[PDB]
Symmetry: D3
């Protein structure tokens, strides 16, 4: 199957999962909105009111589309939506990871000029080490983020929900980044347990600190007897692996009548212009258009 | 590569990972203990003092082996150990999952007579739904656990760290199972945030409850506007899939001289008896014995 | 793709092709009939009024389904229907042909007890040789037909459109079988050209006969200088190949929630009973139910 | 197996089939002609007396070769020959079809500069639609033909037996192309049934016309109730697919002694020059020369 | 390609090679003998005058066939024949070697009841160790030989040229087995160099012995400073591997007309009985009979 | 498995085999020498005292490494060493043989500018034919050798043990090349049997010559009745095959921490510079460094 969308499911999955793209009429909130034309890129499904259509509800004049995503690994309730992580894609071309050189799927593609790809396991370790070592980048408008692991300019991650890959515990810490940075510069420490967000002052010599629990100063986990995790000691990129890890009018004949059909951007919905055919079909699957292709890969970029 | 050991790495991975088996002399705590014979089953590496050897440390009389495991996905500090999840194995035979029928690896194998296998994704959902729906089984000696999804007798999970697969947040809740069961039977509710373990009494009609945060009574997550996760509504097993999902003097010739060599249980260390050969080798890999085979698959059962 | 239906397209294909199954309301002849339950076997789509549903047309009280098939290799007009050849199936199990031992697809499966399979190339040659050698079997109710090539009892082909595989020219001759058999028993000959269906009497010695054209008596094609086609000289079956060429409560877990779902006969439409899920899905494809699965493989037997 | 020759078998196959190339002495018509050198291209086997050899018949002085082809799918009588369709080749390089983009075999290769390839299914539909829509090209010397589907100059098909792919019925119509074009320009209609080649005049308003049967004016098949086949409504080529669908002293060492041997054009017969070896062998198969290689692929171009 | 015959090429190959089977008229020694029927087993090509045919030579009355084999890896002179090693076969079924458990080809199949197979590398080492350790079995009629490595009864190798696998040097020693056994029982030693077959008496204490060169007593190679080859120290068979290493009216339809044809023993030459077909073909290859199939696999057992 | 070393095993194998690279302290001859850094090319293991390390023997001051190779196909005694054939390599890139065009492994790579590769079967035949036809090249310093089969300049083989591929018998003859060339230029003949190296004078007309055995003058094997081996009659290279048969700061991330690690020449031993990791690993295998990688592929060039 072809998945062009990945979401962060906060529960029950608590991880990145293939998602289902859905539409509804923005005015009556019903699944009765038939699109004039399908979405062809992320902006079409992320920016309010980008796209128009016809509501088939009885007395609804609604004309605007409202998109949302759902985790596909299990049943979901009506409003159990998840956030789309648009940087994450199926690794069709089998691009190697910039860090581990393995071919993995799905992958995260940075918005740097080179479009470097990183597997999720490596992105996770990247975020965790930068968080622990206080190496996130402050952006006054966005907040705290990270660029491409290669340190390319103009690659700061903008959709901050990608940091959900940190994990529940670490993500909460990340949400407190600004506050903790303050506490630290005064020589203080922040209790890591979520409920108790209490500030604490210990002596700069001691590494063990206690609160209303027992935790380690440098590592911020439960106090330990010797040394913190080897990964948390204290960013160089293999020149070859980084080159290998780059992410790099189109028509196709109608599957039924073979007349050339023009593709609209990344949109997978094809409409045959031939008046005796008029086949509506999926660019990827070659079959007639249907709800599965819509949910799984309405567009791909 | 062949991994016979899986551990729960609490950080930085925060998930199940292939582990490395290590030995040290129990008396001097140094990696100088040469085993008289290798471990051949889980009891040999889990039960204190099961196995004997020779310490090569200067003045150490130590003769007993002490085993421990480490996450292999990243560097680890000297005492960064992880707990072995002995129910989890590589799915070599490509057994289907009892629940989803997919072939996955690694898998968890229950200790029921049928040895049913379940993929980790499904085991995770199983634990999460049973936790939320308060369907764990109390065992006075062990604590709270779950049997095989098929409900087979004598299949209660004994090594409770397998529930780490719940996730950090859910695992903490699970650790409070006995306490919360008390609070619930009095009609009370337990605050879900880890720091604030505060008991709370609301009216039995209301679903929204507030504490020193805003959460949902039935779901125990942040309060939501409509209905809880579809998976948390309120155990039948597909008869075919369950049958498909079952887990079912041995010698081999020396790779060098071809004399038959007897295998000792699940131990992968083979010792050729032929006096002009004496090859020490790996049952699985066919190469001479070395530290990689020891760490990755010293034994397999 | 999975095709469970094959039709004879009379034009433009003039051959056996994968077909599309369609439904309409029998009373208003519109594609507005939603089936109460899908077809599960050939009788459900071949026998009038077998199945019931709901017409969604404005003022239509229609409740009965009317099925028809269309060639799928090209656009078709509204009423360009083709006849289903229900003996013909995809060779999923890779059964060898009873005659040539090759694995081919699709294949024709005879209705003999052994369910012998024959590839279409071989079925074609079988029909052509039996036609030329006057070895069709008369059945007073049906007309003229052929049994299994192995000569098994109760294997007479009933849906005579399977003989369309003869080809346009030969099929016309076959349609004249009774008449020609009469002409032949009087020592006469029938002109083979379709327009001129003229009876002709020549001398029993001559093989060349002329009509209002020039054709051969024994072969019924254009007169030739020497001997008829080697295949038309004048039925033994390889015992091994014939054995090899035999065609030999089921549930499956919901792809979304994994509850076991019961299959209804050969019907591919699955309906999850789990009230928080209710997934409608394809037994074969594992995806949610849609128009493609309906057209291509609504049922398979 | 490697087939370099395809023929049209008029019966019993009534379709394109792999053919067998044969030679005989042109003077005694016996299979006793040993070629001085083998054919190396189509002209060598198509043009009378191109090639010389030695007849091994008793008192025959014959020195000239006469080539002919036979269908290989079944036994053939002595003079059951079939016409070679030299445009048709095995698709070894897996070139995509110019129309459907599928990789098929065998394929027809047009004689345009680009050497566009078209699968037989698509060539068939091309001929049928052009025939029905009266879009064949008149060439006073040849007769009626079609160029490359891309409309490339100097691509008119010259060997008209390639139109046999039309089918028996349609081919007869095609043979009447000039006559029917006359009848049509006077506003008349030609009866389609082969025997009755009768001209008919109906009123220009009516579409139904009757003859000494009932047929449709526009479609020329049996009269129908609504609309003609969707393919027969009334030539644009996908620029990408057309580029993809292009068809684009050589020595090889002796398989036995490894001395380099020069290939003669497309001829597969290799003769080792090494005096202690003298191996005669097949360029393609690497085995010694034999009757199978001769029949199946004496040459390939 | 399919090779049913293996020979020992004494030069230039000096090893086991696929061989070519040839026939000639026994009386005129010319390759003009056409077999009445082909060989169907080893006895047919090994035992004089087993098979009859027709000589096509001018005035030769010869009727008896004389078979011989030639190495196929290079050109051979007219009488450059090699000895057939009939125990050696292509390992089509991928039987494991009784000693090394590897799947190799070709293999030697012992004539024990179990038909144990051994790869050539292992057979070679078996012969070499038994030779050096003086463990060949004396058979007064045959000479010196070895049975199956498993020590099965009635498995003594009869065609002694299989010991050519020893190698040129070791084979010469083997040819002197009886003589050397005599020299050894008197406490003497035989010089190993082929030219100098001189008997020598040294003192039973010394291991170094000199002749008209310097060699080792126990090893019979050039004198060495320490210990003989580890393999030459001084027969147990892995029960599983030995079981794994066992070697375990037939008709087929004519490739052209599909009439069942009876196979004659191991003979690959098939003759269709159908009078309008009469195809002569190869059981294995499915193509018409030719010189390549004859040379490579005229029969297989 | 990856083998970078091939040796000539003189017994029991008597052929080219994958070898094991070993090290010892040059002063105490014990396997206690730990290399400061591993070998990175042939010169490091072939030239005395190239490399330094630390002896771990009690009172040994030894600091120099001494390398040697052993046949790996069977047990070897302590000093059973074999000669490394450094021209021979695993054919990883699947280069075709310059002579037979087949892809074989291992292959011999000549030291010509083009680095032509030749499979061992072909190299063997090359040496045998040149030996028999007296076409070896004299080099006053080296002795007698052969260049690249293509006759490229500066390609003379320097390590003469590569001629061991001749075989035991032929190799002895080759060792007598200078002497025999003398005997031949006087019109004399050398007896081929190893023990009897006797010079012999026959009449220049006769081909049969007898000694203290019966052998052929031209062929130097046992006298034969007709013509010598077809290969021994009396060097042209296929231009295409010869082009096809050419043999054509590097870092890699640490498998554990992913920091880029610099490779040292052909050495496979990698040492991670990251102070919290320090993984020692194999470039090829990606696993931690061990005795198997050392023996099989310590370096590769
Ligand atoms: Zn989810
Ligand atoms: Zn609306
Ligand atoms: Zn990665
Ligand atoms: Zn970047
Ligand atoms: Zn706290
Ligand atoms: Zn710490
Ligand atoms: Zn279309
Ligand atoms: Zn799709
Ligand atoms: Zn970890
Ligand atoms: Zn100790
Ligand atoms: Zn599962
Ligand atoms: Zn169970
Ligand atoms: Zn709280
Ligand atoms: Zn809730
Ligand atoms: Zn051994
Ligand atoms: Zn191993
Ligand atoms: Zn059609
Ligand atoms: Zn209706
Ligand atoms: Zn068939
Ligand atoms: Zn039957
Ligand atoms: Zn007529
Ligand atoms: Zn006829
Ligand atoms: Zn469900
Ligand atoms: Zn489906
Ligand atoms: Zn045919
Ligand atoms: Zn003639
Ligand atoms: Zn096509
Ligand atoms: Zn063109
Ligand atoms: Zn008519
Ligand atoms: Zn019409
Ligand atoms: Zn040759
Ligand atoms: Zn060939
Ligand atoms: Zn040979
Ligand atoms: Zn004769
Ligand atoms: Zn073996
Ligand atoms: Zn045996
Ligand atoms: Zn001697
Ligand atoms: Zn010795
Ligand atoms: Zn036949
Ligand atoms: Zn054959
Ligand atoms: Zn060896
Ligand atoms: Zn030393
Ligand atoms: Zn070669
Ligand atoms: Zn060269
Ligand atoms: Zn001599
Ligand atoms: Zn000779
Ligand atoms: Zn590292
Ligand atoms: Zn390695």
């Amino acid at each position: 199957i072809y998945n062009s969308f990945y979401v962060y499911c906060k529960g029950p999955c608590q991880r990145v999962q293939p998602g289902k793209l859905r539409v509804q009429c923005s005015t009556c909130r019903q699944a009765t909105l038939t699109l004039t034309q399908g979405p062809s890129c992320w902006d079409d499904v992320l920016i309010p009111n980008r796209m128009s259509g016809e509501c088939q509800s009885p007395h609804c004049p609604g004309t605007s589309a409202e998109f949302f995503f759902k985790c596909g690994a299990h049943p979901t309730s009506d409003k159990e939506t998840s956030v789309a992580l648009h940087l994450i894609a199926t690794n069709s071309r089998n691009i190697t990871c910039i860090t581990c050189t393995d071919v993995r799927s799905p992958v995260l593609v940075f918005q740097c000029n080179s479009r470097h790809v990183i597997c999720l396991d490596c992105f996770h370790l990247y975020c965790v080490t930068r968080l622990n070592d206080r190496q996130f980048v402050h952006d006054p408008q966005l907040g705290y983020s990270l660029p491409c692991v290669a340190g390319c300019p103009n690659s700061l991650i903008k959709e901050l929900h990608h940091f959900r890959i940190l994990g529940e515990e670490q993500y909460n810490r990340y949400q407190q980044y600004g506050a903790e940075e303050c506490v630290l510069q005064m020589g203080g420490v922040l209790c890591p347990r979520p409920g108790c967000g209490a500030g604490l002052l210990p002596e700069p010599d001691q590494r063990k600190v206690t609160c209303e629990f027992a935790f380690c100063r440098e590592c911020k986990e439960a106090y330990h007897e010797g040394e913190c995790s080897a990964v948390f000691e204290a960013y160089r990129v293999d020149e070859r692996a980084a080159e290998q890890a780059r992410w790099e009018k189109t028509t196709k004949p109608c599957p039924r009548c073979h007349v050339p059909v023009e593709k609209n951007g990344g949109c997978m919905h094809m409409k045959c212009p031939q008046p005796q055919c008029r086949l509506e079909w999926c660019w990827n699957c070659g079959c007639e258009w249907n709800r599965v292709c819509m949910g799984d890969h309405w567009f791909d970029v």
